[PDB]
Design an enzyme around this catalytic site. Structure first.
Site, PDB file in Angstrom:
ATOM      1  N   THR C 127       0.804  -1.226   0.000  1.00  0.00           N
ATOM      2  CA  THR C 127       0.000   0.000   0.000  1.00  0.00           C
ATOM      3  C   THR C 127       0.834   1.273   0.000  1.00  0.00           C
ATOM      4  N   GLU C 128       0.338   2.277  -0.726  1.00  0.00           N
ATOM      5  CA  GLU C 128       0.958   3.602  -0.794  1.00  0.00           C
ATOM      6  C   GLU C 128      -0.105   4.625  -0.438  1.00  0.00           C
ATOM      7  N   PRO C 129       0.278   5.883  -0.121  1.00  0.00           N
ATOM      8  CA  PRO C 129      -0.756   6.898   0.171  1.00  0.00           C
ATOM      9  C   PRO C 129      -1.756   7.056  -0.972  1.00  0.00           C
ATOM     10  N   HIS C 282     -35.307 -11.804  28.222  1.00  0.00           N
ATOM     11  CA  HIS C 282     -36.041 -10.859  27.375  1.00  0.00           C
ATOM     12  C   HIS C 282     -35.829 -11.368  25.952  1.00  0.00           C
ATOM     13  N   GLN C 283     -36.922 -11.748  25.298  1.00  0.00           N
ATOM     14  CA  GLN C 283     -36.826 -12.378  23.987  1.00  0.00           C
ATOM     15  C   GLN C 283     -35.988 -11.627  22.972  1.00  0.00           C
ATOM     16  N   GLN C 340     -24.048  -2.965  22.862  1.00  0.00           N
ATOM     17  CA  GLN C 340     -25.477  -2.748  23.103  1.00  0.00           C
ATOM     18  C   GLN C 340     -25.994  -3.518  24.301  1.00  0.00           C
ATOM     19  N   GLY C 343     -25.151  -2.102  27.557  1.00  0.00           N
ATOM     20  CA  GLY C 343     -25.754  -0.792  27.849  1.00  0.00           C
ATOM     21  C   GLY C 343     -24.709   0.272  28.152  1.00  0.00           C
ATOM     22  N   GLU C 367      -6.246  -5.744   4.234  1.00  0.00           N
ATOM     23  CA  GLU C 367      -6.157  -7.026   3.514  1.00  0.00           C
ATOM     24  C   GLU C 367      -7.324  -7.218   2.537  1.00  0.00           C
ATOM     25  N   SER C 370     -14.079  -4.689   2.241  1.00  0.00           N
ATOM     26  CA  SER C 370     -15.366  -5.362   1.982  1.00  0.00           C
ATOM     27  C   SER C 370     -15.775  -5.223   0.497  1.00  0.00           C
TER      28      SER C 370
HETATM   29  C1  LIG Z   1      -4.169  -0.554  10.415  1.00  0.00           C
HETATM   30  C2  LIG Z   1      -3.888  -0.917   8.976  1.00  0.00           C
HETATM   31  C3  LIG Z   1      -2.936  -1.895   8.686  1.00  0.00           C
HETATM   32  C4  LIG Z   1      -2.615  -2.229   7.356  1.00  0.00           C
HETATM   33  N1  LIG Z   1      -1.556  -3.098   7.117  1.00  0.00           N
HETATM   34  C5  LIG Z   1      -1.061  -3.143   5.888  1.00  0.00           C
HETATM   35  C6  LIG Z   1       0.270  -3.715   5.700  1.00  0.00           C
HETATM   36  O1  LIG Z   1       0.945  -4.230   6.578  1.00  0.00           O
HETATM   37  N2  LIG Z   1       0.790  -3.582   4.418  1.00  0.00           N
HETATM   38  C7  LIG Z   1       0.170  -2.956   3.358  1.00  0.00           C
HETATM   39  O2  LIG Z   1       0.726  -2.944   2.244  1.00  0.00           O
HETATM   40  N3  LIG Z   1      -1.075  -2.404   3.550  1.00  0.00           N
HETATM   41  C8  LIG Z   1      -1.655  -2.487   4.752  1.00  0.00           C
HETATM   42  N4  LIG Z   1      -2.784  -1.753   4.987  1.00  0.00           N
HETATM   43  C9  LIG Z   1      -3.429  -0.985   3.898  1.00  0.00           C
HETATM   44  C10 LIG Z   1      -4.810  -1.531   3.553  1.00  0.00           C
HETATM   45  O3  LIG Z   1      -4.679  -2.723   2.780  1.00  0.00           O
HETATM   46  C11 LIG Z   1      -5.602  -0.457   2.804  1.00  0.00           C
HETATM   47  O4  LIG Z   1      -6.029   0.510   3.772  1.00  0.00           O
HETATM   48  C12 LIG Z   1      -6.791  -1.067   2.057  1.00  0.00           C
HETATM   49  O5  LIG Z   1      -6.279  -1.959   1.061  1.00  0.00           O
HETATM   50  C13 LIG Z   1      -7.695  -0.036   1.408  1.00  0.00           C
HETATM   51  O6  LIG Z   1      -6.878   0.868   0.626  1.00  0.00           O
HETATM   52  P1  LIG Z   1      -7.039   2.403   0.915  1.00  0.00           P
HETATM   53  O7  LIG Z   1      -7.011   2.687   2.356  1.00  0.00           O
HETATM   54  O8  LIG Z   1      -6.048   3.084  -0.039  1.00  0.00           O
HETATM   55  O9  LIG Z   1      -8.499   2.788   0.467  1.00  0.00           O
HETATM   56  P2  LIG Z   1      -9.023   3.110  -1.031  1.00  0.00           P
HETATM   57  O10 LIG Z   1      -8.439   2.118  -1.949  1.00  0.00           O
HETATM   58  O11 LIG Z   1      -8.817   4.592  -1.219  1.00  0.00           O
HETATM   59  O12 LIG Z   1     -10.634   2.866  -1.007  1.00  0.00           O
HETATM   60  C14 LIG Z   1     -11.469   3.802  -0.284  1.00  0.00           C
HETATM   61  C15 LIG Z   1     -12.859   3.200  -0.262  1.00  0.00           C
HETATM   62  O13 LIG Z   1     -13.364   3.020  -1.608  1.00  0.00           O
HETATM   63  C16 LIG Z   1     -13.671   1.653  -1.831  1.00  0.00           C
HETATM   64  N5  LIG Z   1     -13.290   1.300  -3.195  1.00  0.00           N
HETATM   65  C17 LIG Z   1     -12.057   1.453  -3.776  1.00  0.00           C
HETATM   66  N6  LIG Z   1     -12.004   1.056  -5.024  1.00  0.00           N
HETATM   67  C18 LIG Z   1     -13.292   0.613  -5.285  1.00  0.00           C
HETATM   68  C19 LIG Z   1     -13.896   0.067  -6.438  1.00  0.00           C
HETATM   69  N7  LIG Z   1     -13.235  -0.173  -7.579  1.00  0.00           N
HETATM   70  N8  LIG Z   1     -15.216  -0.225  -6.379  1.00  0.00           N
HETATM   71  C20 LIG Z   1     -15.874  -0.018  -5.231  1.00  0.00           C
HETATM   72  N9  LIG Z   1     -15.400   0.448  -4.069  1.00  0.00           N
HETATM   73  C21 LIG Z   1     -14.096   0.761  -4.167  1.00  0.00           C
HETATM   74  C22 LIG Z   1     -12.895   0.865  -0.770  1.00  0.00           C
HETATM   75  O14 LIG Z   1     -13.548  -0.371  -0.505  1.00  0.00           O
HETATM   76  C23 LIG Z   1     -12.971   1.830   0.413  1.00  0.00           C
HETATM   77  O15 LIG Z   1     -14.251   1.705   1.032  1.00  0.00           O
HETATM   78  C24 LIG Z   1      -3.271  -1.562   6.312  1.00  0.00           C
HETATM   79  C25 LIG Z   1      -4.264  -0.621   6.609  1.00  0.00           C
HETATM   80  C26 LIG Z   1      -4.565  -0.275   7.919  1.00  0.00           C
HETATM   81  C27 LIG Z   1      -5.563   0.834   8.172  1.00  0.00           C
HETATM   82  C1  LIG Z   2     -47.469 -25.586   3.266  1.00  0.00           C
HETATM   83  C2  LIG Z   2     -47.281 -26.042   4.693  1.00  0.00           C
HETATM   84  C3  LIG Z   2     -46.906 -27.362   4.947  1.00  0.00           C
HETATM   85  C4  LIG Z   2     -46.749 -27.836   6.256  1.00  0.00           C
HETATM   86  N1  LIG Z   2     -46.515 -29.192   6.456  1.00  0.00           N
HETATM   87  C5  LIG Z   2     -46.696 -29.674   7.675  1.00  0.00           C
HETATM   88  C6  LIG Z   2     -46.835 -31.114   7.827  1.00  0.00           C
HETATM   89  O1  LIG Z   2     -46.744 -31.928   6.916  1.00  0.00           O
HETATM   90  N2  LIG Z   2     -47.185 -31.536   9.108  1.00  0.00           N
HETATM   91  C7  LIG Z   2     -47.406 -30.710  10.203  1.00  0.00           C
HETATM   92  O2  LIG Z   2     -47.669 -31.213  11.316  1.00  0.00           O
HETATM   93  N3  LIG Z   2     -47.290 -29.348  10.041  1.00  0.00           N
HETATM   94  C8  LIG Z   2     -46.964 -28.858   8.841  1.00  0.00           C
HETATM   95  N4  LIG Z   2     -47.043 -27.508   8.640  1.00  0.00           N
HETATM   96  C9  LIG Z   2     -47.367 -26.587   9.752  1.00  0.00           C
HETATM   97  C10 LIG Z   2     -46.192 -25.679  10.097  1.00  0.00           C
HETATM   98  O3  LIG Z   2     -45.219 -26.422  10.832  1.00  0.00           O
HETATM   99  C11 LIG Z   2     -46.706 -24.499  10.922  1.00  0.00           C
HETATM  100  O4  LIG Z   2     -47.349 -23.621  10.002  1.00  0.00           O
HETATM  101  C12 LIG Z   2     -45.579 -23.779  11.671  1.00  0.00           C
HETATM  102  O5  LIG Z   2     -45.013 -24.683  12.629  1.00  0.00           O
HETATM  103  C13 LIG Z   2     -46.022 -22.494  12.342  1.00  0.00           C
HETATM  104  O6  LIG Z   2     -47.182 -22.759  13.172  1.00  0.00           O
HETATM  105  P1  LIG Z   2     -48.438 -21.882  12.934  1.00  0.00           P
HETATM  106  O7  LIG Z   2     -48.748 -21.699  11.493  1.00  0.00           O
HETATM  107  O8  LIG Z   2     -49.517 -22.399  13.910  1.00  0.00           O
HETATM  108  O9  LIG Z   2     -48.048 -20.424  13.391  1.00  0.00           O
HETATM  109  P2  LIG Z   2     -48.100 -19.832  14.921  1.00  0.00           P
HETATM  110  O10 LIG Z   2     -47.492 -20.847  15.778  1.00  0.00           O
HETATM  111  O11 LIG Z   2     -49.489 -19.305  15.182  1.00  0.00           O
HETATM  112  O12 LIG Z   2     -47.117 -18.581  14.902  1.00  0.00           O
HETATM  113  C14 LIG Z   2     -47.498 -17.329  14.282  1.00  0.00           C
HETATM  114  C15 LIG Z   2     -46.259 -16.463  14.251  1.00  0.00           C
HETATM  115  O13 LIG Z   2     -45.836 -16.169  15.605  1.00  0.00           O
HETATM  116  C16 LIG Z   2     -44.494 -16.573  15.783  1.00  0.00           C
HETATM  117  N5  LIG Z   2     -44.369 -17.091  17.134  1.00  0.00           N
HETATM  118  C17 LIG Z   2     -45.105 -18.098  17.705  1.00  0.00           C
HETATM  119  N6  LIG Z   2     -44.760 -18.378  18.939  1.00  0.00           N
HETATM  120  C18 LIG Z   2     -43.736 -17.480  19.206  1.00  0.00           C
HETATM  121  C19 LIG Z   2     -42.941 -17.266  20.348  1.00  0.00           C
HETATM  122  N7  LIG Z   2     -43.060 -17.989  21.474  1.00  0.00           N
HETATM  123  N8  LIG Z   2     -41.992 -16.295  20.282  1.00  0.00           N
HETATM  124  C20 LIG Z   2     -41.865 -15.587  19.152  1.00  0.00           C
HETATM  125  N9  LIG Z   2     -42.554 -15.706  18.008  1.00  0.00           N
HETATM  126  C21 LIG Z   2     -43.484 -16.680  18.104  1.00  0.00           C
HETATM  127  C22 LIG Z   2     -44.202 -17.603  14.691  1.00  0.00           C
HETATM  128  O14 LIG Z   2     -42.812 -17.662  14.378  1.00  0.00           O
HETATM  129  C23 LIG Z   2     -45.028 -17.027  13.534  1.00  0.00           C
HETATM  130  O15 LIG Z   2     -44.311 -15.960  12.911  1.00  0.00           O
HETATM  131  C24 LIG Z   2     -46.985 -26.959   7.332  1.00  0.00           C
HETATM  132  C25 LIG Z   2     -47.321 -25.631   7.078  1.00  0.00           C
HETATM  133  C26 LIG Z   2     -47.492 -25.159   5.783  1.00  0.00           C
HETATM  134  C27 LIG Z   2     -47.976 -23.741   5.586  1.00  0.00           C
END
Ligand SMILES: Cc1cc2nc3c(=O)[nH]c(=O)nc-3n(C[C@H](O)[C@H](O)[C@H](O)COP(=O)(O)OP(=O)(O)OC[C@H]3O[C@@H](n4cnc5c(N)ncnc54)[C@H](O)[C@@H]3O)c2cc1C
Ligand SMILES: Cc1cc2nc3c(=O)[nH]c(=O)nc-3n(C[C@H](O)[C@H](O)[C@H](O)COP(=O)(O)OP(=O)(O)OC[C@H]3O[C@@H](n4cnc5c(N)ncnc54)[C@H](O)[C@@H]3O)c2cc1C
Ligand SMILES: Cc1cc2nc3c(=O)[nH]c(=O)nc-3n(C[C@H](O)[C@H](O)[C@H](O)COP(=O)(O)OP(=O)(O)OC[C@H]3O[C@@H](n4cnc5c(N)ncnc54)[C@H](O)[C@@H]3O)c2cc1C
Ligand SMILES: Cc1cc2nc3c(=O)[nH]c(=O)nc-3n(C[C@H](O)[C@H](O)[C@H](O)COP(=O)(O)OP(=O)(O)OC[C@H]3O[C@@H](n4cnc5c(N)ncnc54)[C@H](O)[C@@H]3O)c2cc1C
Lengths: 387, 386, 386, 387
Positions: C127-129, C282-283, C340, C343, C367, C370
């Protein structure tokens, strides 16, 4: 030994068979099945013939005896073609899992054995109109009367509900309202031809339209005591235990749909030109595709991990719920991004992406909603914590 | 001077009329129109009779002469009922806007005046199969031949395309490929009954299913020179200018859908019990509803701001694109959260939320996609620093 | 064969050693090093003694000869303690990588061999600037003059810049402005005691405050031709190739920080009561923690995959960039969520989480930012479709 | 009647004064105050002289008698310069609000009147080490002993804690553990020179480093009954009521910080070139800037709405909590995006953006955390649907 991300040769062969079937047979007809809502009998029968159904059935029952990792890799390939078709096929594994994990030899030979001989369907009945997420809230009643149990209740949203040869059924057997969930329920195998079973209409849902989903009423349905899984009160653990093996398969289904959305969007972005460039050349579109690829890859590894854990003989609840939560969310994000990339064409039914958006939403709901998966992951993570 | 977030008494009256109409007339039939895809003629005729359509038409053309702020508040109420019905009604304002802002006296009296006499529809034709976001990429040709222009081309995705009495049409009038966008296009008023127009099929989309959306073909369509807006080459500025008044109205539609999703989810969460408590008592659900309420409130203020800007006589491009981008995104988020809150029932067609999810997606696409809105906001934003 | 998510026995032993060192030696002093910005010499020396540094050095150079997977697992444990300390240690691997992958036997025994004898530091200068993300934009000049090169240029943000015994340096060797990137640059090993090397101030950054980061200028610095990696013009491929092995290690650092944030937030949520309940009750808080756990697990598997791919002899560019993008993002989300959950205490310097928030931001920047990771993933993804 | 988004001429004059002060006096010294943590006495005194501090004090107490909308517009301009400086100034309004809304004529003339004569500071003491979000959980005791109350307890994180001439203090006056929140607490005006008040060390926080924040112990502190706001047991309503006027001002502070981040990032993006183009020409960067501009504009309207609501004589709880939640979130997103756009320079202390990232975090915590704002919005929203 160490980590490995390479399939075995047998797994590559299963993947190839499922991929060829999804590409040559499912894909070309999936839009028509989604339009008509017809149950996809020819595809189910072909999947059965290819060995892509009932994969968990043990070899001693005439099955393939595959593990969860194998079921997932097959499920991902079928789902890529259509999750409506894949859900019908997977529905068999959901109904069978309680028997596979808790059935005695007689129950497995009788109920699983028949599935290896003919492409019969089965289903699992837990959800009721009043309770789905809250399994401990189910009210279907089972009362012991001599050598049989009498079942009374209504089940809802049953996959393969109108096509099943038999059902796994969960019912409340302890009338005491203070009975803990782990002692209050009983799991049964119920033949579908039993008098008193009243199957409702095909439900019309937003997505997976060719999958069969129905309500079923059980009115004084007689079930022999030999059809009880383990015993009186073991139902909750049997039903919850079955999720360890099925949840990664459901997550794999979401991944297949997500991969399909990504492929459709990428292919379109390589053909459509705007402002003199292909869509892939607009950085906002390439960034979307990159993020979609990241999500699919991570979701696939999440189900592979959950499947490997249970195949290794460990409880996989934490990994399976992470996979279901994450894959369900990303299938939904990818499907809406694929509609977005196709623009006006994406919103249209002649293109394949709007079906993916309608189908994907079920992955945040069935087999444990997104919220329920978070409740599970929270409990497992908090339990794992130590200073 | 000084800020105010209170409607005028006349605005409260328009809101009350539109709300009553949406809740009592649209809501009870919207699911049936979504199922059949039938164009909602009885609702459109009732909206017209109630003075809820064509609101920007000046009083000197027999119209109400309302502003963009008034059009938005009506649009939000109608959209709450159904955005398929609201899009059909709003389609008239999209077609009329180039005439309102760029028409001469004759064009306004003829084409806007007829809309105040009968519940006719109109439409605007810019998008083509090959170009939608890229307006400068349009290829429909307009060739001047004496006192008329000959139009040849295909337009796609036109709202009210098969129901319009006339169209606003944008066509390329300069054959030179180096001609800049500000000189290459001409905007026309084209009567739908002109020989050579072929109305295509009703497109079958995921959402807004009762709205009429069609491709339209123009084969050697003759348009009189008197139907040109401003003049040869002024098309691009006319079409772009019309967005200042229409974009806040589209954002208001997204807000109405979002408010409907929020209401359906809240009401359900106050009735459904799980684990011994109402859904509202599960903190994750209450936090979802709080975030949904935050998003709707902010999206509503965004369109209100964009509408007030243009009504005040200022260019509102930056605010209008912020409103369309944000309201479009939140309508999608809220619709999927409402399906989620209803669970299995939410995925089912007998409940009202899955329709909202299917309808919402169009708000990220039509009338300038989410990406195009960001390109506009960035350009307007950056311009302040250089 | 088949998939496996089980470490080897040797890997479990390395993990145990690194974990014990981070928890017993790094954690108790990390807050003090962040406050003073002192370079953590005692910790670096202890890491070196424990065999937790320079892990990629081959056994034939006196090193441990570990792979990328082993380096990642150690890095994650050290980063959990402090990423300022882990970045100083990892900086050695960044400087050594081009020599490991492209050095001849003499270069490896001389420059890597010395690191196994004493806890010396090294650094890498790209990598270069004027150019960081844009490696092909670098302007540091290397002029061949007989058996040596003369280097002139400024490098920026160099990790261990003021502590290095030697540097890896990338410079432009072809003065022709039309020269393609694959022929224009040369990679060198440069002794830090060479006359003409001028070290800048210690840069004061928001986070990783105990890491040494400095600008370095090379003024007529003479480098012998024996210090050229591969040959004239091979610099770009050497520097780009080094990322395959280093990028998963940087992602593992982000995962360690994320795991620390998750652990500090969970411990606090199990002790703090509000409204008569522990925060975990908490679900909204439990949902948070669940999402944070999901993200850590997926980010860990992402770097494990990238490390296994390169260790198996495959190019891992796609997986390594997915890992760096995802782990960098989630370290930032987790650190702000941990602040998160604590908290008011979270915002305070006597608690450990605000340091994590300041440290995490670098994972989206160094490296490969994304954005650059998304550009790489997009290119690798699209390449599969043609 | 009818909407308006135009300031009055007087408001444009206040905005111009505050903007000139922030840009010419605050900005050039803010980095130095953040480095040293020195309390910014010269800036506070200058803000007081310019009429930019204690704006809510009524004209009959010698104050400007401005409304919440006017306080917000001033707050945004000061915050743009530095939220450390703006929090010290705003701290006066937080302490004064319970007196302005619930003080009798004598209390207002004595305690507010002194603030219009000299640039004294004041503070508000509610939070304790054991309870911050949970106000009903406060344990500081106020024992009524004839004509006075004896206070015993510890307060924590008090803005201007060591600089205040007097404090608003909330204490538990009902020893009965079953006493409801609306009867259990009493609000007091406490002179800072009262024997028994011990001020702790300056707390060293991540951000707003020049603001004074301290713990305070009250040990057998005697407070005369004439210093009670309204009466015994009215404390909870007084403290909660004060948020209606202060919450929009805190949200305006977050908006000022967010606008500063956006300006710094845009200016940099117009100068820095990479891959042959200015950063603004890379679509991902332009999209980021567009989304940042959208968020700042919407957050600004959210506080303007909440301020107009309370100034019009309506309860604004719902709007004020939407503004605080949204502005707090977006200040955090914008500050990290600005660091991102500046790259390596953004992470460095010689550039102005890393300070914004450190300062922004407080907006999700103080004056009601992000979670508490969601709890308030949820209650206000949901209750509208109960019939
Ligand atoms: C802490 C750290 C350690 C590192 N270690 C090394 C190391 O040891 N040796 C080394 O050689 N390098 C190393 N790097 C460099 C690193 O690989 C680069 O930061 C990285 O490859 C991205 O290059 P850039 O920062 O020039 O960003 P840029 O290439 O300027 O890209 C900027 C943004 O645009 C996006 N982008 C760029 N081109 C496109 C495209 N064609 N299409 C879509 N999106 C694009 C990128 O994904 C990024 O989101 C390191 C970097 C950091 C921050
Ligand atoms: C085309 C088809 C084929 C199937 N084949 C078979 C089969 O061959 N045999 C068989 O026995 N069954 C079968 N089923 C039934 C299937 O398993 C049920 O539809 C499924 O288990 C969901 O149950 P339900 O429809 O009663 O939904 P419900 O249980 O009423 O749920 C409604 C919604 O609430 C959600 N939910 C429910 N309880 C909770 C909870 N505690 N926490 C959070 N979310 C919750 C569910 O995820 C869903 O989004 C089939 C269903 C379909 C549509
Ligand atoms: C139901 C419906 C009704 C409509 N009604 C009307 C109407 O009445 N009249 C009319 O004229 N049109 C109408 N349209 C057309 C609508 O405006 C277009 O669909 C829209 O403008 C997008 O154009 P497109 O579909 O050609 O997508 P494209 O322009 O092909 O774009 C495809 C995708 O690429 C993105 N993209 C394109 N260019 C860029 C870029 N430079 N940078 C980054 N991303 C980019 C887009 O955002 C989108 O995600 C309607 C469309 C629909 C579906
Ligand atoms: C710099 C600074 C200045 C401040 N200035 C003042 C001042 O002048 N005067 C004063 O009295 N106070 C002031 N405070 C205190 C501030 O108001 C508290 O920090 C804040 O109210 C949060 O309380 P807490 O820190 O006790 O966190 P806690 O209440 O312990 O909460 C910890 C976390 O749990 C969450 N949480 C708590 N309860 C729930 C729940 N029921 N459901 C879901 N999530 C929940 C919170 O949102 C937070 O994320 C200040 C704080 C700081 C840091």
């Amino acid at each position: 030994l160490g980590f490995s991300f390479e399939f075995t040769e047998q797994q590559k062969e299963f993947q190839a068979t499922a991929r060829k079937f999804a590409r040559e047979e499912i894909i070309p007809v999936a839009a028509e099945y989604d339009k008509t809502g017809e149950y996809p009998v020819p595809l189910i029968r072909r999947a059965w013939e290819l060995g892509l159904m009932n994969t968990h059935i043990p070899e001693n029952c005439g099955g393939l005896g595959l593990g969860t990792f194998d079921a997932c890799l097959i499920s991902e390939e079928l789902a890529y073609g259509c999750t409506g078709v894949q859900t019908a096929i997977e529905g068999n594994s959901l109904g069978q899992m309680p028997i596979i994990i808790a059935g005695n030899d007689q129950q497995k030979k009788k109920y699983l054995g028949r599935m290896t001989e003919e492409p019969l369907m089965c289903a699992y009945c837990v959800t009721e109109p009043g309770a789905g997420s809250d399994v401990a809230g189910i009210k279907t009643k089972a009362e012991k009367k001599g050598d049989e149990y009498i079942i009374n209740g209504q089940k809802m949203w049953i996959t393969n509900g109108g096509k099943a040869n038999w059902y796994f059924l969960l019912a409340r057997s302890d009338p005491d309202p203070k009975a803990p969930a782990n002692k209050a329920f009983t799991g049964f195998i119920v033949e579908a031809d039993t008098p008193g079973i009243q199957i409702g209409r095909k439900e019309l849902n937003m997505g997976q339209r060719c999958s069969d989903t129905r309500g079923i009423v059980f009115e004084d349905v007689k079930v022999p005591k030999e059809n009880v899984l383990i015993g009186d009160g073991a139902g909750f653990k049997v039903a919850m235990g079955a999720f360890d093996k099925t949840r990664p398969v459901v997550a794999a289904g979401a991944v297949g749909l997500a991969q399909r959305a990504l492929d459709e969007a990428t292919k379109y972005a390589l053909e459509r030109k705007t402002f003199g460039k292909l869509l892939v050349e607009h950085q906002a579109i390439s960034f979307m595709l990159a993020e979609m690829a990241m999500e699919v890859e991570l979701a696939r590894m999440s189900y592979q991990r959950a499947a490997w854990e249970v195949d290794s003989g460990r409880r996989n609840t934490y990994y399976a719920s992470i996979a279901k939560a994450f894959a369900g969310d990303i299938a939904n994000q990818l499907a809406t991004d694929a509609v977005q990339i196709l623009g006006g064409n994406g919103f249209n039914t002649e293109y394949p992406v709007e079906k993916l958006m309608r189908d994907a939403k079920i992955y945040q709901i069935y087999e444990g909603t997104s919220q329920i998966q978070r409740l599970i992951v929270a409990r497992e993570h908090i339990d794992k914590y130590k200073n």
